[model samples]
Target: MSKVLVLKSSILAGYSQSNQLSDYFVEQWREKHSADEITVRDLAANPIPVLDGELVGALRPSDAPLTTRQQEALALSDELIAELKAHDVIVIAAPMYNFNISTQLKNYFDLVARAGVTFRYTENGPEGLVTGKKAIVITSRGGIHKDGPTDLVTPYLSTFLGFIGITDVKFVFAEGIAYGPEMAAKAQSDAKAAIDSIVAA
Candidate 1:
């Protein structure tokens, strides 16, 4: 059976658009693959500790022994990385906050994107260690940002995920939420339709 991991980063819980979309998709996925296993990480509701000086020191190659706190920090990072590596499918729910991803999601990325763990330096360039995994990124945006004038977020997210060797990635964006009540409703409907089609495919 395939292993699926859903990483959610919305404090609003049921009210978050990204979380709603993720819940919808996961529900469908579970119906289709009844025997598959699913793991959910609610990053906002239960935040991970931020990387500190001691953790940074442990990550670097040094002669000095790590303190007890430093070792604990490294262990936490290792455990998170291991969970990421074990998953076959990853669903990330990231809402646009301040025109970018939430700080919680960013911190999660920091924990997983460890050198010599998720990726490594190679003669060719930086090489990603985790392979053969698929990712579905669900994002909710307040305004419309397409390929023309102001769509930096999509490209930035795609590139960042690619840097970690997650090449088989798909995006489902619910945009224009802040346009107005009517427009937001339309956008939500359209996004749900798109997600339904993706799930069926």
Candidate 2:
């Protein structure tokens, strides 16, 4: 049985199509692997703080003793990072907002990007320590901008996850929901088929 971490970042939360599609994948996954461990995080519901100087100071041994708030923040970051490290598979539900990933999801990345913990730098350049992981992404968009240069969601996610050593990433997208009924239905069906193949494989 696999340990899966499902990170859902949307103001829409359960109502969001990205999470709806991701939930479908996990539903099928649960059936296929009856005893699998699945953890679902609603990121927007309890939003992570934006990366700040306090977190930076906490990450480094500070010149001064940490204050109470900073200590709590550091503890939270550690717990969040550790939970992600324990997972074998990560399923991210990302919705396009203003042509990019939600700030909540990006904040999660910021917290997880710990130097010498998730990655390290050498003469050859930075190398990631968080390896041997697989990822599946479900993206929902109101418009069909996937083929346009304005499509920042997938490419940015690919790079960010790659930097953390999650190189094998697959995507299932439900696009153009705001484009009206016919196109929306087709896209939803296509995304379902994508998930079906993933479960089969």
Candidate 3:
């Protein structure tokens, strides 16, 4: 069965607009692929630990014995990476916070983007180790920022995911949330329509 992993990082949990969009996307995805296996990670409710000095030390192979803290840190990161590698598709709900992604989602990236694990530095430059995975990033913003606009979040996220070998990435953005109820509703309607088309395609 095709595996689809949904990573949700809304601080308001399921009530956030980004989370709602993600829910809608998954619903449509299920209609398209009813037999697909789905997995979800609610980062806000169950926060992943931030990387620390011990975690960094544990990432590198060393001849010396690992300290207890180092071993614990490595174990956590390893499990996260392994789970990510097992997925065929990933759906990430990203809400713009201070013009960037949430810290919880960033922490998730930190755990999975381990050198020699998700990617490696090769002579040809950094090559992504993981392959054949697709990603759909659903972003919600307080304002509109399309291509050629001043917003840096979308491009940064796209590039970051590509760096880790997730090249098949699509974005469905719900913009103008802070513009007023009318604009917010319009943006959401547009996003839903877009989702329908994407799923049908």
Candidate 4:
């Protein structure tokens, strides 16, 4: 059985379009992989602390002795990275905030992107240690921006995931939601269909 990790990063809980799409995606995925173990984390509700001096010192190589706070931060980082390594599938529900990812999600990324753990610098080049995983990112946008310059979500997430060794990643976009009724309905319909197809495959 496969292990799946679901990350919800939308600030608006009830009204978040990305969260709705992710719900449908999870349902579809569950129907297909009934035996798979699934774990869900709401980044917005329980925000991970953004990188600070002590947290940075804890993660990086240093000769200084670690304090209690540093040790705690390091433990959390290790836990997050361990979770990433244990899961085979990762589902990210991301909503575009100011043309970028939400701060909560970024904080989580900062914690997991640990050197010598998730990734390492080799003599040849940077190598990602977290391998053999697949990621499904469901991104929501106010206006249509798929493959456009304003759609920084896709490329940034794709690059970050690839950097962490998750090259087999698929993105489902639900855009034009704030355009109008027609556009909103169409976007949701298209996104649902895409989710179904991705899960079925």
- All candidates: CA RMSD (Å): 1.9, 1.5, 1.7, 1.3
TM-score of 1: 0.90
Indicate the residue-level lDDT of 180 in model 4: 84
Model 4, 170: alpha-carbon shift in Å?
0.6
Clash pairs (backbone) in predicted model 4: none
> Residue 111, candidate 1: how far off, in angstroms?
0.9
Cα lDDT tens digits for candidate 4, 70-153: 888888889889988999999999889999999989999999998889999999998989999989998988888997888888
Candidate 4, lDDT over the whole model: 0.89
Give me the displacement of residue 20 in model 2, in angstroms.
0.9
Candidates 3 and 4 compared by lDDT, better number: 4
Candidate numbers, best lDDT first, in rank order: 4, 2, 3, 1
Best by TM-score: 4
Q: Estimate each model's TM-score.
A: 0.90, 0.94, 0.92, 0.95
lDDT value, candidate 1, whole model: 0.81
Residue lDDT tens for model 2, 75-187: 87888888888988899988899998999898888888888888888899888878878899988899887768988899999998888788899988889899888877888
Residue 50 displacement in candidate 4 (angstroms):
1.0
Flag regions of model 1 displaced more than 4 Å: 61-63
Q: Which candidate is the best by lDDT?
A: 4
